[PDB]
Structures are given as structure tokens and as C-alpha cells.
Amino acid sequence: MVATAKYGTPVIDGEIDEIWNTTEEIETKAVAMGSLDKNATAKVRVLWDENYLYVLAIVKDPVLNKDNSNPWEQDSVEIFIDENNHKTGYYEDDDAQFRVNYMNEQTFGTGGSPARFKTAVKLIEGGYIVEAAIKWKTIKPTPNTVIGFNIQVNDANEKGQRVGIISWSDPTNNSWRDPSKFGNLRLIK
Ligand SMILES: OC[C@H]1O[C@@H](O)[C@H](O)[C@@H](O)[C@@H]1O
Ligand SMILES: [Ca+2]
Numbered sequence: 344m345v346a347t348a349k350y351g352t353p354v355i356d357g358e359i360d361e362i363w364n365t366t367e368e369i370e371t372k373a374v375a376m377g378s379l380d381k382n383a384t385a386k387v388r389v390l391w392d393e394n395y396l397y398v399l400a401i402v403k404d405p406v407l408n409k410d411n412s413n414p415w416e417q418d419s420v421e422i423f424i425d426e427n428n429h430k431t432g433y434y435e436d437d438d439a440q441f442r443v444n445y446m447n448e449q450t451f452g453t454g455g456s457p458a459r460f461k462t463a464v465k466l467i468e469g470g471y472i473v474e475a476a477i478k479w480k481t482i483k484p485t486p487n488t489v490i491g492f493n494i495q496v497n498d499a500n501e502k503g504q505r506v507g508i509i510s511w512s513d514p515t516n517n518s519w520r521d522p523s524k525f526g527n528l529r530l531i532k
């Protein structure tokens with residue numbers, strides 16, 4: 344799976360800047376658990392600049408819940424990055440997993456850090472919008488640079504149980520440990 348992200352700097356606040364319209368929209372259709380018509384999915388747009396990667400995820404989710412003690416089992420969005428795009432079967436120093444729930448609470452998997460994660464969440468009719476900025480750790484991107492990338496939507500029900508796991512490039516729920524499951528994102532001017 345391949346996608347592109349246009350150069351640009353949006354304001355992280357949960358509001359949709361006009362600039363988001365200049366970049367393509369990708370959908371989370373890779374199902375690991377649940378179904379596209381019954382579980383949470385997101386419409387995603389990506390932008391970038393020399394210091395950060397920006398992600399706008401509009402999540403469809405009629406029932407919001409975060410009762411489960413496991414952060415990945417609360418309604419949330421996870422963002423995966425492979426800066427050198429080695430597509431290894433495990434996380435290298437440059438690889439990271441970031442997570443933020445509908446309450447804008449951040450959690451981190453391997454490689455993720457709050458020092459490199461700025462987020463805002465705005466609830467909308469039928470779901471919520473996540474707008475994030477991830478600071479580059481090991482690279483200073485230039486046009487046509489290609490990174491490994493994925494975005495996952497965790498869907499929890501009224502019972503505090505995760506019933507849906509859907510992402511862009513991974514239908515196996517191994518993104519948290521296997522960068523080879525990420526797709527390719529070309530950073531274009
Ligand atoms: O952060 C670790 C978590 O990552 C999530 O993407 C997976 O769905 C969970 O199974 C895993 O425990
Ligand atoms: Ca904004």
C-alpha cells in the first residue's frame with residue numbers, strides 16, 4: 344500500500360485547516376477484528392514539514408468508551424512510523440507507536456514519546472476528529488522521502504471491550520511490533 348502526504352503546517356486544534364484539502368485522503372479498510380460497516384473506521388489525511396508529520400483522522404464511532412484499563416482497548420487512534428523505512432520485522436530505534444483516545448489522552452508503544460507527540464481531539468456528530476503532530480526523531484525529511492506508515496482505529500463498546508481493530512495497511516494487528524506491516528508514505532512537495 345502506498346500513499347502521499349503534501350508539505351504543509353496545520354494548526355493542531357481539532358479544527359480542519361483549509362490546507363488538509365490539498366492532500367489525499369486514505370481509508371482504514373484493513374480489518375483485523377470487526378467489520379467496516381459495524382466498527383470504527385477513519386478517513387485520514389497526512390501532511391509534513393521539516394520538523395513534524397501531521398495526521399488528521401476523522402473517526403466514525405457512534406459509541407465512545409474508555410472503561411477498559413488497557414489503552415488499546417479504549418476508543419482510540421494509533422499512529423505508526425518507520426522513519427528509515429527498513430520494513431524490519433521488529434522495532435528499530437527510529438520506529439514508533441503513538442496512541443491517543445477520544446479524550447485526547449496519550450499513551451505510547453515502543454519508540455513513542457510525549458516529547459514528540461502533540462494532539463487535539465474534537466467530538467463531532469457520530470464520532471471524533473484526531474489531529475496530531477509527530478516530531479521526527481532520526482530524519483530531516485526532503486521531498487520524495489518515503490517512510491513506513493500506518494494508522495489503526497481501536498473500537499471499544501459500551502461494555503469496555505475492544506470489538507474492532509481496523510487500520511490502513513495491516514489486517515493482522517501486528518503493527519505494534521512489526522514495521523513490515525506498515526505501508527509506504529511518500530512525502531511530496
Ligand atoms: O501497545 C501495544 C498494543 O498495540 C495495539 O496496536 C495492539 O492492538 C495491542 O494488541 C497491543 O497490546
Ligand atoms: Ca487544525
Ligand SMILES: [Ca+2]
Pocket residue numbers: 425426427428429430431435436437438522
Ligand atoms: Ca525503522
Ligand SMILES: [Ca+2]
Pocket residue numbers: 383404405406407408418498499500
Ligand atoms: Ca466505540
